[model samples]
Target: SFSGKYQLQSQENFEAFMKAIGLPEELIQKGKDIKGVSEIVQNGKHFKFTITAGSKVIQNEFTVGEECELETMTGEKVKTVVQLEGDNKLVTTFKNIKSVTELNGDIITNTMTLGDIVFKRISKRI
Candidate 1:
């Protein structure tokens, strides 16, 4: 997920950003369909997100430090690694999920939203 502050340089830059992270062409083309703002706050190895899209608000929080495994409600296991930079940016890498689904998670929710694909708030240990 892109858990950082980003200002789109241009339509091409926006498209390229999406593509760099593996966003599908269709969704990239429909980008205008969703109007929203996103904010990401990092605390140590933990991070939170606040996203407002259209009239819907969603939040999610996660921490990346040690190697850990988590199971979603659907029984899918996800492995993640959290990397911290000298500049205080946190990069959480997820594995074992389809790229499309991963991109969707990055697009949707924020540090405040935590749940499976169906949406629930369950604290997970990493």
Candidate 2:
């Protein structure tokens, strides 16, 4: 049900993705080495997701088909709708970036794309 705590194991193309999103080089360097953690709690069609990356924490709550306000990596608050695919995949778009988070067994994979740059993060249940 995508309800679990997972710690990041690895990432790919992080620098390029951050650059594409217009994040500052200093912030990107500070964030690149951090291993993030994700905690998700789901009840019925309602869901709460919390992410901890480095010293920054971002949280969001929403229903499957409803719109909600979510903060971006650079702390920009944006409105978006989060959708569930099949059962374990979540798809959302904000600030011209598309993000997909999928849960498989004990592994959680999150991919974000800005233009042609893709950032992929893998986390495992802890």
Residue-level lDDT of model 2, residues 1-126, one tens digit each, is 788899988898988777777788676876687987788898979898888877767897788898888878764778898988888999988878888998889888888887777788888999
* TM, every model: 0.38, 0.89
Question: Candidate 2 has what TM-score?
Answer: 0.89
C-alpha lDDT of residue 68 in model 2:
82
Question: Which residue pairs in candidate 1 collide?
Answer: 48-111, 49-110, 49-111, 59-112, 59-113, 60-110, 60-111, 60-112, 60-113, 61-111
Q: Per-prediction RMSD in angstroms?
A: 11.9, 1.6
CA lDDT, candidate 1, residue 80 = 63
Off by over 4 Å in 1: 1-35, 67-79, 96-126
Cα displacement (angstroms), candidate 1, residue 52, comes to: 2.1
Q: Give stretches of model 2 more than 4 Å off.
A: none
